[PDB]
Specification:
The structure is cut from a larger assembly and holds chains A, B and C. In chain A, 87% of the residues lie in helices and 0% in strands. Chain A is rod-shaped and about 75 Å long. Chain A contains three helices and no strands. Chain B is of the alpha+beta class. Chain B starts with a helix and ends with a helix. Chain B has a two-stranded antiparallel ribbon. Chain C has three domains: 115 residues, Vacuolar atp synthase subunit c, domain 1 (Alpha-Beta Plaits), CATH 3.30.70; 183 residues, Up-down Bundle (subunit c (vma5p) of the yeast v-atpase, domain 2); 90 residues, Alpha-Beta Plaits (2-Layer Sandwich). Chain C is 42% helix and 8% strand. Chain C is built from eight helices and nine strands. In chain C, the strands form three sheets. Chain C has a four-stranded antiparallel beta sheet, with no helix packed on it. Chain C has a three-stranded antiparallel beta sheet with strand order 4-6-5, with no helix packed on it. The radius of gyration of chain C is 36 Å and the shape is rod-shaped. Chain C starts with 9 loop residues before the first strand and ends with a strand. Classes of the chains: A mainly alpha, B alpha+beta, C alpha+beta. At the B-C interface, α1 and α2 of B face α2 of C. Chain C: Belongs to the V-ATPase C subunit family. Chain C: One of its GO terms (biological process) is proton transmembrane transport. Chain C: Keywords: Acetylation, ATP-binding, Hydrogen ion transport, Ion transport, Membrane, Nucleotide-binding, Transport, Vacuole. Chain C: It comes from Saccharomyces cerevisiae (strain ATCC 204508 / S288c). Chain C: It is a peripheral membrane protein.
């Protein structure tokens, strides 16, 4: 029971909880950042063929 | 045991305990050895497995 | 205190929380106690600036610490096994980069103002990344120096073998000054010559056997030819058909069976090989000392970086998220390990715990149970605080 270290442990609890939360946020940002083109250009080709 | 815990987890843990009232015999030697029960909690799963 | 070789003007590595205050006489500042109230001829009280680094999960910190300590062991062994040969060559006897300016900078001077290098390590890099970088760099430089030293040892053995044949016995030496056409008349074959080397005492067995030895002897082939004062050399020319008799008899009158003849194609080989061995050893020794000098500073830079990362990780290991913890470095007088180790730990004994009181203190490995192996995976026991034995 070292007063500062024991409370630092419970502080690190939330600190790393939110750090991993934000890393997950970055990952999910990237997972869709590229998705704004692959589905928005390969699917729109369903109409140019009929138009031609 | 508590000292090695304190000096392997590096001075950060919750460790409270209560003693065994009216102890019982062991099983390795069939001897009424004084006993204690403990409780421990931590955040890390690696800690748990260690 | 001796962690490196040829200790001189040594330091110590210490870290601490910024707000932490010593307890031997309250109301004392950090420098007040360090520079003045610490006994010792000199105390180069100084800070130790180090970059901040990534903060991984609490779970892993321990395994990275174990891995870095493990690799620290091997890199220490490597620096030791290179310093041993850095003195084992036995060319310079005063010193060789033991106290001489490392990287063109006196070792204490270099370290006391050495800053972190942002060349092979960047602001935001994974801890495993830097660990592997140092590990593989050191391992490759090691393998290089080991292979080079093995080649040098092979060359030394070969040239020693060459020298032993060159001198060590007058019977094994490959003569190159007596073989001539005038005594080895190699032409249309009629004869069969052979060299003889017999001790002086037995000279009667050959001299008085001047012509009773056998048939088919050659005049002037037994008379005085050459004498070494220990052996006597002739050219025993016997014909090319009755070689059997003397060949059989050669094994009971102590004749050297070294079949030699006038053939320069073999005579030149020994001289060229000996000279080439000498020249290649001469080139190899200089190349090896140059390589040793080059890799020496590199490996110490690596090992100092290992210590720096070790202490950096252990800092947060001690305490919480805020990296605001003060680190100080002080030079130490030679041969004063005991008093420094005592007083420095005394001033902050409060940081060895709060309710864990044992009379034995320090960090030298000791056992009082079936435990205490100083291993965070099986058995480890007290440490005073963030610190490590170090002189240079």
């Amino acid at each position: 029971l070292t007063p500062n270290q024991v409370n630092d442990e419970l502080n690190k609890m939330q600190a790393f909880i939110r750090k991993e939360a934000e890393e997950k946020a970055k990952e999910i940002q990237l997972k869709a950042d590229q998705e704004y083109e692959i589905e928005k250009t390969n699917i729109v080709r369903n109409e140019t063929n009929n138009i031609d | 045991l508590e000292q090695i815990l304190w000096r392997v987890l590096r001075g950060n843990l919750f460790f409270k305990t209560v003693e065994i009232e009216q102890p019982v015999y062991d099983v390795k030697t069939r001897e009424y050895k004084h006993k204690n029960a403990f409780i421990v909690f931590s955040h890390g799963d690696l800690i748990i497995k260690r | 205190m001796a962690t490196a070789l040829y200790t001189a003007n040594d330091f110590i590595l210490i870290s601490l929380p910024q707000n932490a205050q010593p307890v031997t006489a309250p109301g004392s500042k950090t420098d007040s106690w360090f520079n003045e109230t610490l006994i010792g001829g000199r105390a180069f009280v100084s800070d130790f600036k180090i970059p901040e680094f990534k903060i991984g999960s609490l779970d892993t910190l321990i395994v990275e610490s174990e891995e870095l300590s493990k690799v620290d062991n091997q890199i220490g062994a490597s620096i030791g096994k290179i310093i041993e040969i850095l003195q084992g060559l036995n060319e310079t006897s005063t010193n060789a980069y033991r106290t001489l300016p490392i990287n063109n900078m006196p070792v204490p001077e270099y370290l006391e103002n050495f800053q972190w290098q942002t060349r092979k390590f960047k602001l935001d890099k994974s801890i495993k990344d830097l660990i592997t970088l140092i590990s593989n760099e050191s391992s490759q430089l090691d393998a290089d120096v080991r292979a080079t030293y093995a080649n040098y040892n092979s060359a030394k053995t070969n040239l020693a073998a060459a020298e032993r044949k060159k001198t060590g016995d007058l019977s094994v030496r490959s003569l190159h000054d007596i073989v001539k056409p005038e005594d080895f008349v190699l032409n249309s074959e009629h004869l069969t010559t052979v060299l003889v080397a017999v001790p002086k005492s037995l000279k009667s067995d050959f001299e008085k056997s001047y012509e009773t030895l056998s048939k088919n002897v050659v005049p002037a082939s037994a008379s005085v030819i050459a004498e070494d004062a220990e052996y006597v050399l002739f050219n025993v020319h016997l014909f090319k058909k009755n070689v059997q008799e003397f060949t059989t008899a050669a094994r009971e009158k102590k004749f050297i069976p070294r079949e030699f003849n006038y053939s320069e194609e073999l005579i030149d080989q020994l001289k060229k090989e000996h000279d080439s061995a000498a020249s290649l050893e001469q080139s190899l020794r200089v190349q090896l000392v140059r390589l040793a000098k080059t890799a020496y500073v590199d490996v110490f830079i690596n090992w100092f970086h290992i210590k720096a990362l070790r202490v950096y990780v252990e800092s947060v290991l001690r305490y919480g998220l805020p990296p605001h913890f003060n680190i100080k470095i002080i030079a130490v007088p030679p041969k004063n390990l005991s008093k420094c180790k005592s007083e420095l730990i005394d001033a902050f004994g409060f940081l060895g715990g709060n309710a864990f009181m044992k009379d034995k203190k320090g960090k030298i490995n000791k056992q009082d149970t079936s435990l205490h192996q100083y291993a965070s995976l099986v058995d480890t026991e007290y440490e005073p605080f963030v610190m490590y034995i170090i002189n240079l």
